[PDB]
Amino acid sequence: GDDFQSRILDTPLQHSDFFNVKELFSVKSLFEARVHLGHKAGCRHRFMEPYIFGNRLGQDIIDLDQTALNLQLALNFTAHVAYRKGIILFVSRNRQFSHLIETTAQACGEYAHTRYFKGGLLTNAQLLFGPSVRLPDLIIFLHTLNNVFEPHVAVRDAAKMNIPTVGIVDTNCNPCLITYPIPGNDDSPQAIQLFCKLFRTTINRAKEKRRQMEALHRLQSPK
Amino acid sequence: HFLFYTGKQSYYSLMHDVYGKVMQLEKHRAESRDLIGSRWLI
Amino acid sequence: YEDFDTRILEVRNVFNMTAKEGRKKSVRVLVAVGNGNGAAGFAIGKAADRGDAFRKAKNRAIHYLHYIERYEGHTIFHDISLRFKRTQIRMKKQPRGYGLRCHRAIIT
Amino acid sequence: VESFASMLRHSPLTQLGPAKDKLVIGRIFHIVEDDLYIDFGGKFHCVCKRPDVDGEKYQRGTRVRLRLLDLELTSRFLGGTTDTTILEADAVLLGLQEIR
Amino acid sequence: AGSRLETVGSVFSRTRDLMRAGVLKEKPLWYDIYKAFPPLREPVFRRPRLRYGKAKADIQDIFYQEDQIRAKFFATYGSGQKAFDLFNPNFKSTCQRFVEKYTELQNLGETDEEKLFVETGKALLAEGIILRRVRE
Numbered sequence: 001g002d003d004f005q006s007r008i009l010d011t012p013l014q015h016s017d018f019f020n021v022k023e024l025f026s027v028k029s030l031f032e033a034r035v036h037l038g039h040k041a042g043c044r045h046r047f048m049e050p051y052i053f054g055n056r057l058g059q060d061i062i063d064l065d066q067t068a069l070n071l072q073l074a075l076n077f078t079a080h081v082a083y084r085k086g087i088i089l090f091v092s093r094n095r096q097f098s099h100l101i102e103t104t105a106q107a108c109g110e111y112a113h114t115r116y117f118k119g120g121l122l123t124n125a126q127l128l129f130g131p132s133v134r135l136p137d138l139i140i141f142l143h144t145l146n147n148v149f150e151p152h153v154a155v156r157d158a159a160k161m162n163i164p165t166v167g168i169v170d171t172n173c174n175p176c177l178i179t180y181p182i183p184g185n186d187d188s189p190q191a192i193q194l195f196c197k198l199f200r201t202t203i204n205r206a207k208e209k210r211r212q213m214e215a216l217h218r219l220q221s222p223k
Numbered sequence: 224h225f226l227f228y229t230g231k232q233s234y235y236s237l238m239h240d241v242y243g244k245v246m247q248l249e250k251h252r253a254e255s256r257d258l259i260g261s262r263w264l265i
Numbered sequence: 266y267e268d269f270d271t272r273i274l275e276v277r278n279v280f281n282m283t284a285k286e287g288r289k290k291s292v293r294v295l296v297a298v299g300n301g302n303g304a305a306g307f308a309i310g311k312a313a314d315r316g317d318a319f320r321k322a323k324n325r326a327i328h329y330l331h332y333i334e335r336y337e338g339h340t341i342f343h344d345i346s347l348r349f350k351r352t353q354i355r356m357k358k359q360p361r362g363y364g365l366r367c368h369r370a371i372i373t
Numbered sequence: 374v375e376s377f378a379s380m381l382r383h384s385p386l387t388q389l390g391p392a393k394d395k396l397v398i399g400r401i402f403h404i405v406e407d408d409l410y411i412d413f414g415g416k417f418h419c420v421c422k423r424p425d426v427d428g429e430k431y432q433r434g435t436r437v438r439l440r441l442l443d444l445e446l447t448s449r450f451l452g453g454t455t456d457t458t459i460l461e462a463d464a465v466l467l468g469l470q471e472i473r
Numbered sequence: 474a475g476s477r478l479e480t481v482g483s484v485f486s487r488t489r490d491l492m493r494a495g496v497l498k499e500k501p502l503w504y505d506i507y508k509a510f511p512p513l514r515e516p517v518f519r520r521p522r523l524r525y526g527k528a529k530a531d532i533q534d535i536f537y538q539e540d541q542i543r544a545k546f547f548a549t550y551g552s553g554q555k556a557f558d559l560f561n562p563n564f565k566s567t568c569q570r571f572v573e574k575y576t577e578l579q580n581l582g583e584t585d586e587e588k589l590f591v592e593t594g595k596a597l598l599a600e601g602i603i604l605r606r607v608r609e
């Protein structure tokens with residue numbers, strides 16, 4: 001009874017890669033999707049220089065070794081959150097990829113907000129949505145900037161509410177408030193499609209694992 | 224609903240469908256006045 | 266939040282000139298909250314009525330709760346000197362039985 | 374497993390060198406009226422105008438020829454702290470690629 | 474009741490504090506996950522500042538040794554009349570074949586750059602590649 005619930009929720013945290021997210025991606029796979037391509041040196045943020053492999057004739061290149069390490073952590077965190085039945089909200093303001101990101105959230109079984117973000121959505125949730133509204137447990141920022149080249153309002157407002165954020169950060173973004181930054185290209189369609197696939201496969205695996213874990217432990221109770 | 228946190232889940236759920244329809248018509252490829260004496264709903 | 270207590274630190278009657286009313290008055294209240302066990306916060310509430318400004322500040326401050334580290338539960342871990350804007354503060358760690366010897370607001 | 378450093382050294386984009394006045398092959402993925410959105414293998418797409426000659430030939434998926442100018446159009450202006458970018462590339466459409 | 478102070482600490486440290494304070498009685502579901510698999514860097518606020526005086530960034534300009542050869546090829550013959558295909562991961566351009574042959578001759582031991590550049594042009598001419606020495 002109580003032992004089974006402890007097994008379902010506490011056993012997953014005793015393994016470094018419980019969901020085997022390492023196999024989903026590789027440095028070679030990321031390089032095919034152009035995840036190493038950054039903005040010009042003029043557009044560079046000072047807090048992104050750690051993640052930048054170098055400047056190839058004006059275009060910053062993103063180290064895909066740091067990206068692989070950080071992406072492993074971010075996918076690992078996103079899976080445990082999905083395993084525990086947490087709410088995951090995808091957030092982006094890029095209108096080229098608005099339909100793709102809304103389609104991904106629907107495929108995963110999660111939520112997407114790709115439209116104009118209302119001031120107070122998280123800091124004033126009860127008024128906007130209702131008294132007992134449950135806020136997201138994780139926000140994934142496929143794009144961390146809005147369409148005026150400023151940080152998305154939900155980055156600061158998600159920290160105010162103490163919500164962890166998994167965000168794709170490019171060479172012109174500010175990763176300081178992103179809990180799990182993933183350095184990588186955010187503009188190319190091939191990069192965004194790769195990231196959307198990874199987050200969708202990861203979330204579906206974690207949800208499937210929970211069902212199997214519950215069936216095995218549940219069956220033991222009669223058996 | 225997956226668009227609950229947008230604040231207009233039904234307006235954006237409808238705008239999601241019509242934008243997906245447009246994409247398939249644009250990807251896949253007569254007179255358009257199939258209906259006359261009609262107006263768009265207010 | 267029965268374990269939290271609220272204290273007033275300043276009540277001010279600021280004024281905004283308006284064409285309709287000429288001089289219009291608002292009550293600006295600064296309050297602090299704490300549970301006496303390491304957690305405390307402050308906020309400012311403004312309203313036209315003093316009772317409303319008290320409610321606004323009191324419930325706003327509960328959303329800005331710092332946790333303050335106490336050495337053995339009775340003093341700060343080390344001397345602290347800082348300047349915030351033009352205000353200078355020089356705090357000193359003291360032994361038990363020394364008591365609070367500080368600005369009345371700091372005592373509060 | 375090949376290292377990222379090796380991948381970058383032998384990458385087609387690293388071989389291209391400077392992208393000014395280079396010739397590249399692109400693919401039309403989006404068309405809005407007479408505006409063609411062309412992916413030439415870089416970070417940002419370019420946007421060209423449908424040529425008067427053989428206008429009907431330029432449909433989605435059509436591979437074309439281009440003369441790159443910039444991979445990203447950016448420029449710092451008076452009083453700016455960062456370069457303003459329009460998230461677009463600069464290229465001159467030369468015409469369709471011969472399938473051969 | 475919370476800590477809407479996003480410029481002091483991090484979501485994890487502020488959540489740790491609210492639990493020690495006595496205000497948050499139930500752990501968030503994401504908390505234990507962060508404890509076991511934290512990020513590489515702690516997500517703490519830092520105000521961006523400009524560099525002043527003689528402070529400079531630390532970004533290495535990416536220049537391989539082939540660029541010395543490639544620069545000469547583009548200045549002498551321009552870009553190959555064949556168009557670059559940046560969608561083929563194994564594309565070999567006219568210039569990249571020039572640099573592969575120039576390297577091969579350099580392995581043999583030729584030390585003169587002038588010798589390696591005119592010999593490589595002859596080898597590609599035998600291969601049949603159309604190299605135009607366009608000064609224009």
Ligand SMILES: [Mg+2]
Pocket residue numbers: 039170171185186187
């Ligand atoms: Mg970008």
